[model samples]
Target: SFKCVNSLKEDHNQPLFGVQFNWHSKEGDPLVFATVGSNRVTLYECHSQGEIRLLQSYVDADADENFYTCAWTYDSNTSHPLLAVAGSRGIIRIINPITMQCIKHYVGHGNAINELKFHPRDPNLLLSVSKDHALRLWNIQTDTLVAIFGGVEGHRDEVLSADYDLLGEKIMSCGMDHSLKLWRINSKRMMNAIKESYDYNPNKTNRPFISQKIHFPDFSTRDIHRNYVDCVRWLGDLILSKSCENAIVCWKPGKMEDDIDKIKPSESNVTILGRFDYSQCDIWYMRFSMDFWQKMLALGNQVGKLYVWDLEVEDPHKAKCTTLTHHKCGAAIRQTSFSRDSSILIAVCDDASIWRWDRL
Candidate 1:
């Protein structure tokens, strides 16, 4: 990571729709640690002596599209070094770090894409979830459709957030339906899920391609929160989901695995490992640390405060919870993410500010 910052365009910019660090790619001409906001992206370079420099802001040409979630492609994926920005109105555009121009695009979601992510193994693979109640899988290289997980596939309402497991073998998603679901890619029942979500009159020319369906246990009767399930994430083998009801529920999939994994939006079991509530705050946006930072769970909520929790505690009633107040205007936040190495925690708010917290 011997990259040095060449410039800093401004002292600051607008509050952002999201914040994410662009880790220095192994294929970098040098190296970089970067971040993104509305129409601007920031690159940070830390020197060997511990001093840090800021690179000039990378501006997106489009002012209308909400340049929200951003990520750098895996070094193994692209040739000239690339990163992507997920935009509002169903636009997922890939930008060339070399040109700062939109190089490719993926647009399939009808309303808004609540989240965007790349696969763990295939650099050309992209994942998106939306308010349209669907999870879209896109192959970036050819810009082809991979799968759509929605309709009768589960999720009766808008899907707020979703993500791939570290291994990319499974996906965790939650929404307004008051349920959290887990989906396995290319599963045996996937093909059926696609057909259920989409209509196709098969001919010799155009046939069917699949698929996405996350399994859920009897959520109606489950002990989990019964509010708007805003976001869900995976922490090791366990799943965590947050709702607008001022609570977070940790779940174990194995508790009802036997009844799930079927072709329908069926009911099985739900094992709530631990339940966490943010005193008087609706924990809407949340993310768990990816690695050894796994010890921490970071959350942003409607009360405009950053809440951090110690996940190792055995007692659900007594898990250590720390509140880091940032946006005092009490505006709701829709995004919070951790750096690739899990050293930095970033939260974005509707109050026109971003919070960058580094425990290190």
Candidate 2:
């Protein structure tokens, strides 16, 4: 059995598509933003006193349908907090927080929106991955598509997730094809591909900025999980890859020879780390804390179970895991995030309800 620290059941009346914590906020209060599959996105202000209050709600006056994925800008130069919402009709709405107004609407992808992410370094740059099997880079300042990273041949199926390296020089994307592709943002080239047969040599500096059809030779050819690949995050030197497979795999670029004897298949190679497992659900989203002290992973199950793993203990793998089974049915958990301060974890579900877990 799992303990319920706290929960709120207020439904937004549509399927919740995404949830994120505003890291740019100056105040340390835990503020969460959630997007529904319809035309609404809700922001909640969470206080240390254990209260969750609605801060704001945004809806497009011109949108006939709903938004699929929502992302916020960390750019401080911008007049106010900005949000990018991908719609079902292949349109992206950029909204301003102060006025709660739609500043710009982008139309580039011809298919349904699957994922949207802001460049880690350049807040003005954003990446969007879609079912059209493409990854797009947009210049938020000019409200234009600066570069197109993927096209028809990019992925065999939908592109589920795309992220940029901390330096913003390279962007990584993974999808239904069971492969991860790396691209050089400036050169607009495919740098390296991680597939079953490909071996990455970190020591070779002369390697092409882009590589094609390279597979992650270490893993089994079997599907990572029974479902599609869901998300990928770049944690400094290592890459954290997740899937419907119910497992989160970590990859380091350097050769594994030196550490092979000490590294267990599931054991983390890093010193400050945490780990956990979920039996029935697949991890849809996983992210490491900024300081590398903690890890937050969210699982979405076929039975509607949502589980959160906080690696706060000395041995995270041996630490007790937290499970929240409050939803009526297991709705797809689309997105999850922790505030920059690591005070709270926010989860958004297809049921259109937002849940929060605080570190008390």
For all predicted structures, in order, the TM-scores are: 0.73, 0.73
Write the residue-wise lDDT of candidate 2 on 1-360 in tens digits.
333345554444676666666666656434655544577766777765667777667766755666767777854474356788885677777777555677778886878777788876667767788877777776666454555655444566777777777777666677778765666544323222221112433354554323232222121121233456667666554555666656665554324443422333233233323334566554443322222233555555545566666544554344455666764545655666666766676666666656666666
Give me the runs in candidate 2 sitting further than 4 Å from their true place.
1-6, 9-12, 28-32, 61-64, 74-79, 186-227, 252-277, 282-294, 300-306, 310-332
Name the runs in model 1 displaced over 4 angstroms. Answer: 1-15, 27-62, 75-81, 186-223, 254-265, 283-293, 312-319, 325-334
- Predictions in order: lDDT: 0.60, 0.59
Cα lDDT tens digits, model 1, 283-310, are 5543333323466676666666667787
**Residue range with the least summed lDDT across 10 consecutive positions in model 1:** 1-10
Model 1 gets an lDDT of 0.60
Clashing pairs in 1: 7-55, 7-56
Clashes of each: 2, 15
TM-score of 1: 0.73
